[PDB]
Nucleic acid binder design. Structure first.
Lengths: 148, 239, 328, 331, 331
DNA sequence: GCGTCTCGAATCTGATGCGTAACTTGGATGCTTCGTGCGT
DNA sequence: ACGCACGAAGACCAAGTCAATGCTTAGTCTAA
């Protein structure tokens, strides 16, 4: 992190006066008398996610040319890309000696060999192949403690 | 030679010379090995602020006098303005005498550079106190000696100031108003790099020496960091 | 497809930052306990790294407008300026699920979670409006990726770029505006003023007595109308750059974006409706490096196809498409 | 709907800027501690971006009138000259809470926090007066977008546009005025003047002795006496101003109400300085959606005829029940 | 209610602007440091916007009389001509605090922090005098708007309108008057002249020798003696002035009191220069809501009879009880 | 038809007070289920 | 005649914080 993490705040709300006007004019078919900001169609919601300035470095085994070509079309990193978070100023792909840092800092399968693991590995539930948010694909896996 | 800066990425060029944002294309920087390696910087820093005080002139004159005594051959002392040179030439003339030659309002590269070239070939070990004009354009390569590695007509050179705010164009004032003090610092970095352009104008130079004379580089003030980065490319003299 | 919109705000832009922050009369943010403190609603500032004061890197706050606010503003502009009139022209009516999906992408209409067939995804992601803003019970991935409204400032050089260096502002761009609320009863001066009040002089006397008693009790240890406070806003006249990208856009979607940009000037940015904050005028719109902003709005020979496509889409648009998208 | 009002102030406009400021007798703001300083209440200035002939954009102060202050001015003008006379013609009475909410937007400092029904929102936003300002115990979004009072100045050219350049003023438009308070007892000169004072000579002697003792104690140390000498900063008279009013999808009744307010606005005053007759102004031109609708009589013409008819009908049908419903707390 | 008073000054008007300004002996204001730097007390001027015939908005100074000075002049006129005779006949004596509050708007420099009850506000705002002049420990808004005394000049045409073009003056209306103070002892040059001073000629010789020593020491260095040479800048005599007094919703008695003051206002001075008989003026015309109500005798006519009558009964029923209530502290 | 001399000089060259007061010193919302009954 | 409206209700502990940015000094002549 080039700077401390910033807690970013975003909300969600349907304009109640605009909806009332549409309800009056027949654009909206709602018979309910009042909006409910606590829940339902007109719920106001408050959520937060952290924003960080960072340089993304990771290690892999593959083709330099093809990986560089794939990363050429990448414009945004991480998530919340619809609101423009994590634009890519640039990228670099370099060949480095194996002794620097291994590719093991990831979700390895449960019975992975100890010799290839860099550092401590805590057992947890995570997916081994992308997509990683699919909870039906979640399996017990060794997740690096010094990276989570 | 001063298009791309260390961190500006030629933005100053695109702004000074207005170019459409899409029409401009940058190029990677290049530098031959014989441009940075064959020179070492002496750690003889200046102990006084580069003002116009007579005592600062005395100390700088003594430092550059011992440099000239130690100088291998023809040397160049980079003076920013006529005010500093005139304040400095009086002390030098006591020891150097005729060996020192300085620009005037009339004296310039019309004949002074030719005279310096002739005197250097004569073995006088001449000292050229450049003022503004000598900062850019004039040639200090011993073209006749086609080794080419002679490194004697400009064996040594000394800088008296960074400099700071040499450009006085109203466009520069507009730019410094728009962007702040950052632009003038990197413009002075450009000027300092331009002054180093006098050091080499032929390939295969082998051994030259450099002196820095400004207490600001030794005062550890935050804004001279780009100058530190620029001079850090050059190995210091192991004194 | 990259859209670069150069926005200059005529009036100050006020995006309220969460939190209870205080200020003193002299203007000191978060004054110490010694002096009086007044509540302050600061502008939305994002911590960014920049070369401030010839430093290598400084994490200085930059007053911006959140990207989600810009996204919602664009959605509201489309809805209130092209989509809603087009649906009204057909006398279309939307259920609560379809309307919630259309105006906030809320899945309340069918929170069960509906599968989407590949043909359905192809048809719907090609919708001129709902494709750009995914959501609803289906909850697709929208084709619109709008950036935050970063001001053209010295600290935003590494976020905006150096293409618009001529319009940058060196100093701070935030100013504190003080508000005040006065009790109308204390400003009565004659029985003619109190004629409209049903209680006349007696009601005003009771109101003032209650106010005095409450104030005395509060001093010794129900809140009245009187209030003094300030809110921080970004100074007017500063130029802003808005970057919009549409991933794999159809002609209809680009036409809709151009129409929204045409009608965007009539809307406001962020908050401040009471004080007419956020008013702005579009200065330049850039499509894939080509300037398109004419003095009469977005026009030109290179955008007629988008306008024709979006007009054709508006001609044949029906509420049934919204219902199908919202699974209603 | 965009309304642009062109205002030239007959008397200087003085809007107090919060915070303590000091000035010396010469006129130097925030003088060095060595010189004598006097309290100063500066005219409120909002930082704005101004472009010059050099092309550089810089932040400079600009003396303006806050949007909130003259929004309240417009509300008070409407209530005093259009709404309240209409209510009093039919002998309609408002409760103290209804009056407080009509004049300030709330009956108390604690909002209800309960959402309003859709039909109530539509009815209130269709009200000629309540629709413009909204507010109430349950926050209702008003239709009136009202802007601050920007003087037509070289600094405000970027803000107010270049179509009013003919009325711009180049130099500074701010001047400082000094005020003094005198102890009346120090101007007594005969027992006839002190004959009306109870006790007379004894009372005056006690007052002067106490004043001298207090001043001597204050001087040696290095309540408050009547003597005072300070200054307050005002905007010079004769400068033109631009007022911009926007309404979100206005009904004809609300447009007519705003036009009537503009007709009756000249009798009111913009900012503070009631004793010094500050804030007096005359409206020069009113622009409605890019069209001038101002005559020497005022807002008039067939273009504004329908707005006036609609607002007259609404006022004839205007009752206190709407205000009582609007200001009724949901709790 | 608008009242316009046309005032012409018989003698020069001298309202001194605070600040130390210097003038050379040839009339140049703020000369170079090389020349002499005699002190000057300039007349107070407010910058105003005026057209020089080309329609350009040029900010130029204008020698005026402060509005606060005129307000206090009107207050003093009413008190010393109307209120004081009325209270005296009934043997009603104001307390020292009531006297100070009436003559200065406050009995001390620390106003109360609590608002006043509505009954008190109604009673005070209806009072013939206290209603016009607000103030007191509880900040109360008065009914009087006193404007500055703007001279009818080409620069003030934009401010005061084009109604008084025939009375406008083009050239500068400001002049410098030189003042010198002599040391009496130096002029004393007879043994009979010194026959009154104790010690005879010895005291005069000691005075002269002390003066010589002091001036020699001060010149060598490069108290203060009696010798002086100064200058004060005054507005020339004979120019016409426009005075605007505006009152919001007045009772009959208050307007009657204002008219009574205007009848007896000419006997007072405008501002400053008591020793040199500065500030003398004569009222040319009084405009009452667009109608001239000024007779050669004074404020008279069939139109204004009811105001005078009403203020007459108001004075007859007046007492000191309301003054004591107004000036009483609420803490 | 001019006529020239003289065609200034010294000295003052500011003093004193006042040189803030009171009050506001935030307020509200951001949850779904469950039972019972309308109800279009 | 299943769908939607609408109040009551049930979890219920509970702090420490609230800046993030200051910085200097005169040569050019090679188009009217």
């Amino acid at each position: 992190k080039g700077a401390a993490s910033q807690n970013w705040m975003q909300t969600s709300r349907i304009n109640t006066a605009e909806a009332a006007r549409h309800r009056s004019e027949g654009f909206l078919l709602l018979r309910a008398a009042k909006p409910n900001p606590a829940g339902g169609p007109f719920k106001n919601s408050l959520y937060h996610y952290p924003l960080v300035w960072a340089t993304l470095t990771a290690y892999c085994v593959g083709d330099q040319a093809r990986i560089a070509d794939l990363l050429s079309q990448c414009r945004q990193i991480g998530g919340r890309r619809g609101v423009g978070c994590g634009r890519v100023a640039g990228f670099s792909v370099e060949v480095v000696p194996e002794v620097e840092c291994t590719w093991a800092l990831r979700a390895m399968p449960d019975d992975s060999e100890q010799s290839i693991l860099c550092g401590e590995y805590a057992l947890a539930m995570s997916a081994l192949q992308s997509p990683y948010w699919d909870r039906s694909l979640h399996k017990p896996a060794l997740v690096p403690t010094s990276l989570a | 030679a001063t298009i791309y800066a260390s961190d500006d990425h030629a933005v100053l060029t695109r702004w000074k010379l207005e170019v459409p944002p899409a029409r401009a294309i940058y190029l990677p920087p290049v530098h031959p090995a014989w441009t940075t390696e064959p020179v070492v910087l002496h750690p003889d820093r200046n102990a006084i602020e580069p003002n116009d005080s007579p005592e600062w002139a005395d100390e700088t004159a003594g430092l550059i006098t011992k440099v000239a005594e130690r100088a291998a051959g023809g040397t160049l002392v980079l003076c920013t303005s006529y005010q500093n040179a005139e304040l400095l030439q009086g002390r030098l003339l006591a020891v150097l005498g005729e060996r020192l030659i300085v620009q005037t309002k009339v004296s310039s590269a019309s004949m002074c550079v030719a005279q310096y070239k002739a005197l250097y070939r004569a073995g006088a070990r001449p000292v050229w106190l450049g003022v503004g004009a000598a900062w850019t354009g004039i040639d200090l390569s011993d073209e006749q000696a086609t080794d080419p590695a002679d490194d004697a007509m400009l064996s040594d050179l000394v800088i008296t100031r960074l400099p700071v705010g040499l450009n006085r164009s109203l466009t520069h004032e507009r730019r410094v108003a728009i962007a702040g003090f950052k632009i003038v610092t990197l413009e002075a970095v450009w000027q300092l790099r331009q002054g180093l352009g006098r050091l080499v104008r032929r390939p295969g130079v082998k051994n030259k020496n450099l002196w820095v004379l400004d207490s600001r580089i030794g005062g550890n003030t935050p804004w001279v960091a780009p100058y530190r980065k620029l001079l850090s490319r050059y190995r210091t003299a192991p004194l | 497809m990259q859209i670069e919109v150069l926005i200059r705000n005529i009036t100050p832009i006020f995006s309220a930052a969460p939190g209870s922050y205080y200020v003193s009369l002299d203007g000191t943010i978060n004054p110490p306990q010694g002096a009086s403190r007044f509540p302050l609603t600061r502008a939305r500032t994002m911590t960014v790294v920049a070369e401030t004061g010839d430093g290598v890197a400084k994490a200085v706050p930059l007053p911006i407008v959140p990207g989600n606010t810009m996204r919602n503003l664009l959605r509201r502009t489309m809805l209130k300026d092209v989509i809603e009139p087009a649906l009204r022209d057909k006398s279309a009516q939307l259920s609560i699920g379809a309307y919630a999906t259309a105006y906030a992408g809320n899945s309340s209409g069918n929170p069960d979670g509906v599968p989407s067939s590949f043909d359905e995804i192809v048809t719907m992601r090609a919708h001129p409006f709902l494709g750009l803003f995914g959501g609803g019970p289906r909850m697709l991935q929208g084709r619109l990726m709008v950036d935050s409204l970063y001001p053209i400032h010295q600290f935003s050089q590494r976020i905006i770029g150096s293409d618009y260096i001529n319009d940058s502002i060196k100093g701070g761009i935030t100013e504190i505006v003080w508000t005040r609320r006065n009790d109308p009863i204390l400003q009565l001066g004659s029985p003619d003023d109190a004629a409209v009040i049903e209680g006349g002089a007696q009601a005003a006397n009771d109101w003032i007595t209650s106010l005095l008693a409450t104030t005395k009790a509060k001093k010794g240890k129900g809140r009245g109308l009187k209030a003094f406070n300030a809110h921080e806003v970004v100074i007017a006249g500063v130029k802003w750059l808005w970057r919009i990208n549409v991933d794999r856009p159809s002609e209809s979607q680009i036409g809709l974006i151009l129409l929204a940009l045409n009608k965007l000037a009539n809307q406001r940015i962020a908050g401040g409706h009471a004080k007419d904050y956020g008013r702005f005028v579009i200065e330049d719109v850039i499509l894939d490096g080509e300037s398109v902003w004419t003095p009469s709005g977005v026009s030109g020979q290179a955008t007629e196809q988008f306008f024709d496509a979006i007009a054709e889409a508006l001609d044949g648009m029906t509420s049934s498409e919204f219902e199908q998208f919202a699974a209603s």
